[PDB]
Amino acid sequence: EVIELPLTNPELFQRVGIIPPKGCLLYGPPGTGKTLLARAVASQLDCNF
Amino acid sequence: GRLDRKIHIDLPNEQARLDILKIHAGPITKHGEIDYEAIVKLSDGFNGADLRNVCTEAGMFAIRADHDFVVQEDFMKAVRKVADSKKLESKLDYKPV
Amino acid sequence: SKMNLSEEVDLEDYVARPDKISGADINSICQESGMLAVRENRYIVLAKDFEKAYKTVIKKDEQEHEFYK
Amino acid sequence: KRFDSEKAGDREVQRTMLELLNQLDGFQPNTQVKVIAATNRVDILDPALLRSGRLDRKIEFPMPNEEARARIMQIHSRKMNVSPDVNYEELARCTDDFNGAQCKAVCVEAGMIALRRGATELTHEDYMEGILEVQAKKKANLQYYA
Amino acid sequence: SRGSSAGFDRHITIFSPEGRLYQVEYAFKAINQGGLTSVAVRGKDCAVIVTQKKVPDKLLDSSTVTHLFKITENIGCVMTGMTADSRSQVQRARYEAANWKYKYGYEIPVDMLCKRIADISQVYTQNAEMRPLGCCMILIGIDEEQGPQVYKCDPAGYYCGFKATAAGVKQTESTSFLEKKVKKKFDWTFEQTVETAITCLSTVLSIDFKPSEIEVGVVTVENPKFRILTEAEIDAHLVALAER
Amino acid sequence: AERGYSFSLTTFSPSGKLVQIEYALAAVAGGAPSVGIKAANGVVLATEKKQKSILYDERSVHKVEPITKHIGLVYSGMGPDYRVLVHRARKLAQQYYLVYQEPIPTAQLVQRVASVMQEYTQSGGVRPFGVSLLICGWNEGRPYLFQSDPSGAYFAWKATAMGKNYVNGKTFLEKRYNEDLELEDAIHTAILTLKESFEGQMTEDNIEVGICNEAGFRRLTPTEVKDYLAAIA
Amino acid sequence: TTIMAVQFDGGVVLGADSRTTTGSYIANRVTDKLTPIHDRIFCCRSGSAADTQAVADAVTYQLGFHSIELNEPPLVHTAASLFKEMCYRYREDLMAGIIIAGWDPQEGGQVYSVPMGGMMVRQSFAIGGSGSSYIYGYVDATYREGMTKEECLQFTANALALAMERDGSSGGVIRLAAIAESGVERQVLLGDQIPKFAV
Amino acid sequence: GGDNEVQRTMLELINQLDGFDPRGNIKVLMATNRPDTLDPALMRPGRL
Amino acid sequence: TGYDLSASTFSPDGRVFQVEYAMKAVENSSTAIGIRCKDGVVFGVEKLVLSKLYEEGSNKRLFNVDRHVGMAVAGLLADARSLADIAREEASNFRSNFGYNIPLKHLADRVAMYVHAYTLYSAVRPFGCSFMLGSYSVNDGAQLYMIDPSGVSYGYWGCAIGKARQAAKTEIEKLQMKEMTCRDIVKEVAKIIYIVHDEVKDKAFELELSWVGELTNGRHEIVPKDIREEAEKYAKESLKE
Numbered sequence A: 001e002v003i004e005l006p007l008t009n010p011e012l013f014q015r016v017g018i019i020p021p022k023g024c025l026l027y028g029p030p031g032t033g034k035t036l037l038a039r040a041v042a043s044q045l046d047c048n049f
Numbered sequence B: 001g002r003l004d005r006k007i008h009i010d011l012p013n014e015q016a017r018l019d020i021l022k023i024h025a026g027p028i029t030k031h032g033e034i035d036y037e038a039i040v041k042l043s044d045g046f047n048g049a050d051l052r053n054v055c056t057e058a059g060m061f062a063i064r065a066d067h068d069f070v071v072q073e074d075f076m077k078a079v080r081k082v083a084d085s086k087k088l089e090s091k092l093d094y095k096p097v
Numbered sequence C: 001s002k003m004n005l006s007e008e009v010d011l012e013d014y015v016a017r018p019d020k021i022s023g024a025d026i027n028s029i030c031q032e033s034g035m036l037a038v039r040e041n042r043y044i045v046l047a048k049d050f051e052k053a054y055k056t057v058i059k060k061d062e063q064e065h066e067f068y069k
Numbered sequence D: 001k002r003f004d005s006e007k008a009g010d011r012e013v014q015r016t017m018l019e020l021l022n023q024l025d026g027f028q029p030n031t032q033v034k035v036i037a038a039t040n041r042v043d044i045l046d047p048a049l050l051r052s053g054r055l056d057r058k059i060e061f062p063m064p065n066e067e068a069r070a071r072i073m074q075i076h077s078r079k080m081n082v083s084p085d086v087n088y089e090e091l092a093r094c095t096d097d098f099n100g101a102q103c104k105a106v107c108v109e110a111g112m113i114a115l116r117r118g119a120t121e122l123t124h125e126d127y128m129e130g131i132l133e134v135q136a137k138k139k140a141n142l143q144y145y146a
Numbered sequence E: 001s002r003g004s005s006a007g008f009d010r011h012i013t014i015f016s017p018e019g020r021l022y023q024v025e026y027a028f029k030a031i032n033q034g035g036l037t038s039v040a041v042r043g044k045d046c047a048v049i050v051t052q053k054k055v056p057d058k059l060l061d062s063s064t065v066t067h068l069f070k071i072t073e074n075i076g077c078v079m080t081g082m083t084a085d086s087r088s089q090v091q092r093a094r095y096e097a098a099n100w101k102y103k104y105g106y107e108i109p110v111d112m113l114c115k116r117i118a119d120i121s122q123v124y125t126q127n128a129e130m131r132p133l134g135c136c137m138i139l140i141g142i143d144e145e146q147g148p149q150v151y152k153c154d155p156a157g158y159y160c161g162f163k164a165t166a167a168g169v170k171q172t173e174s175t176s177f178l179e180k181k182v183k184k185k186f187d188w189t190f191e192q193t194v195e196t197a198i199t200c201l202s203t204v205l206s207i208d209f210k211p212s213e214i215e216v217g218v219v220t221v222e223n224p225k226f227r228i229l230t231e232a233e234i235d236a237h238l239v240a241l242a243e244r
Numbered sequence F: 001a002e003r004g005y006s007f008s009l010t011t012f013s014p015s016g017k018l019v020q021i022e023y024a025l026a027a028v029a030g031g032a033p034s035v036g037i038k039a040a041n042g043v044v045l046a047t048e049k050k051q052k053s054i055l056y057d058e059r060s061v062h063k064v065e066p067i068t069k070h071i072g073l074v075y076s077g078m079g080p081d082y083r084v085l086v087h088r089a090r091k092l093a094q095q096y097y098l099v100y101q102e103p104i105p106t107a108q109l110v111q112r113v114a115s116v117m118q119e120y121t122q123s124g125g126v127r128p129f130g131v132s133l134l135i136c137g138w139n140e141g142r143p144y145l146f147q148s149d150p151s152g153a154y155f156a157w158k159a160t161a162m163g164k165n166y167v168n169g170k171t172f173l174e175k176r177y178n179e180d181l182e183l184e185d186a187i188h189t190a191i192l193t194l195k196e197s198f199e200g201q202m203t204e205d206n207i208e209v210g211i212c213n214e215a216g217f218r219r220l221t222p223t224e225v226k227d228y229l230a231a232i233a
Numbered sequence G: 001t002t003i004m005a006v007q008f009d010g011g012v013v014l015g016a017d018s019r020t021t022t023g024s025y026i027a028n029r030v031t032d033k034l035t036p037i038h039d040r041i042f043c044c045r046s047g048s049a050a051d052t053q054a055v056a057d058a059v060t061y062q063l064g065f066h067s068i069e070l071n072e073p074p075l076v077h078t079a080a081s082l083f084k085e086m087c088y089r090y091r092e093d094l095m096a097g098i099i100i101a102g103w104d105p106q107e108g109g110q111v112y113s114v115p116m117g118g119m120m121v122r123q124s125f126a127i128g129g130s131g132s133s134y135i136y137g138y139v140d141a142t143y144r145e146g147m148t149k150e151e152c153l154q155f156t157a158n159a160l161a162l163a164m165e166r167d168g169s170s171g172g173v174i175r176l177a178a179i180a181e182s183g184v185e186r187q188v189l190l191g192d193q194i195p196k197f198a199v
Numbered sequence H: 001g002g003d004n005e006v007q008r009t010m011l012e013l014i015n016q017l018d019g020f021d022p023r024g025n026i027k028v029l030m031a032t033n034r035p036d037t038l039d040p041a042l043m044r045p046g047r048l
Numbered sequence I: 001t002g003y004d005l006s007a008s009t010f011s012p013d014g015r016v017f018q019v020e021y022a023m024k025a026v027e028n029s030s031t032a033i034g035i036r037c038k039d040g041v042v043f044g045v046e047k048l049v050l051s052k053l054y055e056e057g058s059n060k061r062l063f064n065v066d067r068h069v070g071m072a073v074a075g076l077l078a079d080a081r082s083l084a085d086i087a088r089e090e091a092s093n094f095r096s097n098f099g100y101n102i103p104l105k106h107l108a109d110r111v112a113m114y115v116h117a118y119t120l121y122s123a124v125r126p127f128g129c130s131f132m133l134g135s136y137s138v139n140d141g142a143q144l145y146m147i148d149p150s151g152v153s154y155g156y157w158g159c160a161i162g163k164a165r166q167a168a169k170t171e172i173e174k175l176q177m178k179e180m181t182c183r184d185i186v187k188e189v190a191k192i193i194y195i196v197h198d199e200v201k202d203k204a205f206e207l208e209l210s211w212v213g214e215l216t217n218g219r220h221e222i223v224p225k226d227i228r229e230e231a232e233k234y235a236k237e238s239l240k241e
């Protein structure tokens, strides 16, 4: 919701009257899938990464 | 403003542990790993990767006994083994943002 | 005022509650609440979205203080 | 990597540590290069350098018991001439809390006591005085209150 | 200032240069060591306790793992923390309660039986000779002239009267869920209360329970005895909360 | 079980200071603001009540206790240490009342409560108490306001503050206190000088007030305080 | 004073009379000498009025503390043993005839006599006090093994009615109490309900 | 990171009298006066 | 640093370290298993013989705490014999004042509460000793409790203590036991012991067993010699096969 959605349809946020958020922090105890999660994003979003 | 989201990825839950095990255990040849509920019940404190270990360990007992398949004990032992060293091997603390 | 409002925002509730936040934190609240409207496919924001947005980024930063002094 | 206080920290070993943590995970996981890591104070390690994905199977070394000591001394004796007098069963029970490094040292010391005495064989008496030597023990010359 | 050490001050219970007792700020971290959470909700006719019950094995008997203790006949309470310290403080409650009845002849109010658990804890704060107990008692019980009541007393002493509290791992998360259901305000019948308690614990942990995963202690004004609900009665409320 | 330690933990430093009492005074200065104002026919003891949700029941505890028919306390600092001193005071008052059949004078009670707090800076294996008591009382025709410190000292005041921002409040009081006030401001002026250190909106269940006139000490009912909070009374 | 406890199958039937003499002046003519020790265990205090009260209270204090630590309805034999320990240690100071009888969930109704000395013995029916002397015959002829709750509530009435005609330290109303698994059915006989044997 | 710098130097000394490194034929004296302080892995036979 | 020198010191973590260590002194002892069936309790100790010089079947780890209450211990043995006397002393003051054999639910809570009083002060050292109390009565059935250094007691259907705590809890989970007569359990216990023992880490062992159940009429004994042999023959056969 912070990577794809407002990278495709920025207009949805101008109608509300805000600006999409710039940047996520994945944090949490080791081994829980923080790198695997970005691995999944990189396989799919289709743009420079 | 600089970083707008604080996504906290937490330790797996009851459903979760199960889904991860099922994702990992799938590729293992077997005769019916039917007791997932004791496995999920013992595997507390297990993070995504430590369930990835359990499914391997269960494999290793098979390679040791020289089977071409695992069984329901292989995954029962592996959870006891991993769970001993996981507790032994240093305490993990939550670091909030 | 630059975004869509509720019929009743009661911004006075969200000014009283906490007791230390920045001009950036605030601007982040509104960004979040609005962003909850985009999930809900609603044009404007609502009085519930702006209450979860305030607990998401502000109340998160509010921890435990010992209650015996 | 638990340091964080704002004045000191080190924050140098830590970075080249986080390089090691992204050679065991991230990117392509290395599957053609195994990693054996040895330490003797596993308690001061960073949790992110244990769990699975890094050090997976964790072998503890238990400090030899009685039977192991007997095989450990008997392994370093073969290099030299020992009488058939020696009784490894007894020596092993004689030592206690010894490591493979100390049992090793015993044989070393026995041979050193046979070098001084002027013989070429180890008797059961040399090993007994080696144990007294390689065993930490201060010069307590009041040990006459039995 | 700013956290400095007075040498000894993290090993006994004496003031730091800041103006705090590091030894008591630690004994609170024991409560969360337990790993359990307990909610308590006050109605207008009844007070409810609901506790997560975690049987780790198939070996442990399930009827001797409980956290709900009968202190009087009109005072229950739930113990969170180090299980050893807990049982040690419950034993001490029962003693005071029955010592009270023996000296004054009208069984003890829930008010005072906390005030005494609180003051015993306070001594362990003030001396260096021992640590404080690492647990946290929540008492409930019907008062003869103020309706039902809920009290919670901490390892330091400070104890207070509540409308809804929690204690343990999700002690912050719960009190954010509860205070929303308190400023709205309802009738708070007997079925209202049990409803608010289970749905709070069930959502903050995400479990959605089986009757064998919670124990529910409750005390009504019609019948002031402290019951612990069996699995049969607990299930009637869980499938009623799955409908609604 | 145990025996107990025997050696004092309050010790002199090379300075000539008793570091433990110096620190226990810094705990006092973390506590909730409290003001005291001797009138000319009563004493007012007002205090910023503690709470941090809407779940707390703001009538199950009291920061303004009665010690006797003619005595009162509020405190500033650790809440457990306050229930200990309130309880050793109420017993002191009852030994005094049991021997002379006469309510304990207020000069007396403060001088004894202080000697209990002095005992914990020179006893084995204890830390000093973490509170300052403000003791009002009205005996022998007059009002009295005292204040004992975790040290053990005590000073009669004509009006004072303790707790958080007690240097701003002693200044604010220094000007606004002109003797010969009526009892009813000391309330008004007291409540004002809580406000010079309090952030938020004051209500009838958020502060606690106690007066102390010839008729005897009494805590003010919630209704009663709501009226003085017309900020005009 | 006379106190009496009989044992039938469901439970027990206690019976006392109300009159605390102090020499030849009567101090209280409606005294309650059937004291609840717990929920289904009663004691009948006789002998020194001030000694028994202290002991009774002291056993309640221990017995109630004791039942909450086990979470079980205490046994009658337990609340007996506690009077036994009490009356024997202080057999110099005191002077207390007790009669503990109650209904147990695992031994039936029971009656235990604890006389002046601190002896303890179980009995089918017991009988004590100062007026008990005068009814050892009537109570030995008329009792037969096996009764119903309705043959006992009339039995003790008749007994305590004889013991009040002859003793001087007995009189007033009769208090009975039937203790069964059900609960406790306390009743008072006064005026004409008190059986009569005049001749 | 107390003494984390000095400590790491010692691990290097330890490591070169006991690692894999067979090592030539060099003897080693160590004269302390406070042996109570030396790390156990520095003290045990086969290095001293 | 200085959070382990005292039982009276929480650590910053949140946990008393001196109790942690005690429990690790248990883990370095031989293994003892308890297993409660529906009409008795059977006890099993894996007593190592460290020389051929100790007399056979002597210096047991199976106490009688009362005439109907076994106590099988693991951990540092000196402190064990100390508890076994505090417990005998409690289960005597209870028969004195209340006049009837003490109920095991209570004897446990009282011996745990006594262990707990030793983790509070700095003037004493927490016991290095976990142990199980078994018991049988005809008004309460079999009950089996287990205490540890912390001062925690928990009802159990089976449990184990000592250096093979993990391997033995498996064998009992893979065993039905709410349906077996006492007589059948003893065979299981022997078989479980033999499995969990390593003769590549220890020399040999003597197998100690204890009834307490319907067989003996609510007393607690040690299993008679003949039935002990039968349980050792049926245990070598399940290791052959």
Ligand SMILES: Nc1ncnc2c1ncn2[C@@H]1O[C@H](COP(=O)(O)OP(=O)(O)OP(=O)(O)O)[C@@H](O)[C@H]1O
Pocket: A028, A029, A030, A031, A032, A033, A034, A035, A036, A037, B020, B023, B047, B048, B049, B050, B052, D025, D026, D048, D053
């Ligand atoms: N939530 C999960 N679901 C499925 N698999 C997982 C999950 N978490 C971890 N794994 C498995 O564990 C392996 C390693 O976990 P991963 O590297 O994602 O943890 P991490 O959070 O990046 O660790 P660190 O915090 O040390 O960087 C992955 O390759 C994956 O197969």
Ligand SMILES: [Mg+2]
Pocket: A034, A035, A036, D025
């Ligand atoms: Mg990662």
